[PDB]
From a paper:
Recently, a promiscuous PHBase from the thermophilic soil bacterium Lihuaxuella thermophila (LtPHBase) was identified. LtPHBase can accommodate many substrates, including PHB granules and films and PHB block copolymers, as well as the unrelated polymers polylactic acid (PLA) and polycaprolactone (PCL). LtPHBase belongs to the secreted subfamily of PHBases, which most likely function to scavenge hydroxybutyrate (HB) from a few environmental biopolyester polymers.
To test the hypothesis that LtPHBase might adopt different active-site loop conformations in the absence of bound ligands, we identified new crystallization conditions that do not include IPA and we used PEG 400 as the cryoprotectant instead of EG. The two most notable differences are distal from the active site. Secondly, the five N-terminal residues adopt different conformations. These changes in the structure can be attributed to differences in crystal contacts and suggest flexibility in these regions. Slight changes in the surface helix (residues 155–164) appear to be primarily responsible for this difference. Most notably, in the apo structure Met155 is oriented towards Phe81 and away from the Tyr159 side chain, which itself is in a new orientation compared with IPA/EG-bound LtPHBase. LtPHBase is likely to prefer lower-molecular-mass, non-film polymers due to the apparent lack of conformational access to the catalytic triad, as seen in our apo structure.
Numbering used by the authors: 1 to 222, 225 to 302
Amino acid sequence: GPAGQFIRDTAPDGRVYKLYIPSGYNGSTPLPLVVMLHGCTQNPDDFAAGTEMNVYAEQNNFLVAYPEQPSSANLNKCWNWFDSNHQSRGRGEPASIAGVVEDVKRNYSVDSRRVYAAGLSAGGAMSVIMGATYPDVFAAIGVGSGLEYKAATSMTSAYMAMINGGPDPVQQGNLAYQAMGSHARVVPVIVFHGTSDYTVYPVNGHQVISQWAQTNDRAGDGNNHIDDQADVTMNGSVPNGRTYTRYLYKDQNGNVVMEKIMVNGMGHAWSGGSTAGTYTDPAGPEASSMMWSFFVNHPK
Ligand SMILES: [Mg+2]
C-alpha cells in the first residue's frame, strides 16, 4: 500500500543515478543508503526491477541509489573494474560513485554510518573497489558474482581474470589496504556467487573473500586477526529452489566480518529476485534480503 518514489537525478559530475525514497522518509531520521551498482548491459531501472531492492528499501525504511554506467563510459555498460583509472580514490568512477553518495547526503538525511555498496558482476567488482577506496564512506559491501581488488589492471587482462581469477589474493589484499590510505578500517563483505557461473567463474568469489581477509586483517593493525578460514559452514536449501553453502568468517573478537554464499548450479545472476529484471535467478536464496541483513548488522 504505502508507496515511495523512484527519482532520477544527475550529480554535479554528470553521473546519472536513480534514487528510491521510501514512504517512511520524513527527513527527521537519517536513513541508511544502499548504493546498488548494476552489472554489464544493465541500467538502474533493470537492476532495481530484478533485485527488488526498492521493495526492501520500502519495507526497511532505507534509501537506494543506482548510479548509471552509460554506454559512453564502457562499451558494455560495465563499471570499469579492470581499469587502473577506475581503481583509486579521488578520480574516475570511484570518485563519481562517492560523488553520488555525497549528492544524496546533501539532498536527504542519510545515516553516515549505514552507507553500503553492493552490485552484480562488474558492479560487484566496483563495490570491492568502493570498499578499498572509500572505506570512510561505505560501512560494508556486497559482492554478487564479482572479482577481487585489481583482479585485472587493464582491459587486456580482464577476460582472463573473469575465467581464471586474479593474482594472489593476499597481495591484492595488501594493495586494497594501501588504497585505503589513512581511511583504512575493516570493511565487512558479503559475497554471493553461482557455482555454474560461466561469465565470472566462481574462483573469483573465493578470491574476493581471501583478498578481503588480508585487507581487513591489515586494517586492524596499528588488534583483531582475520583470516580466510571459514569459522562456520552450513548447507542451506531453498524450498523448490536451489541449494547453497554459507561460509562465515569471524575475527578474533567474535564478530562476523565476512560471509560467502555459493549457490549450487546458479549461473551469472543475482540470487533470488524477480524475472522483472535481467540477470536474476529466482530459485536462488534471496541475496537482496541476505545482503540487507548483513549490512544493517555491520554499521560503520
Ligand atoms: Mg577464521
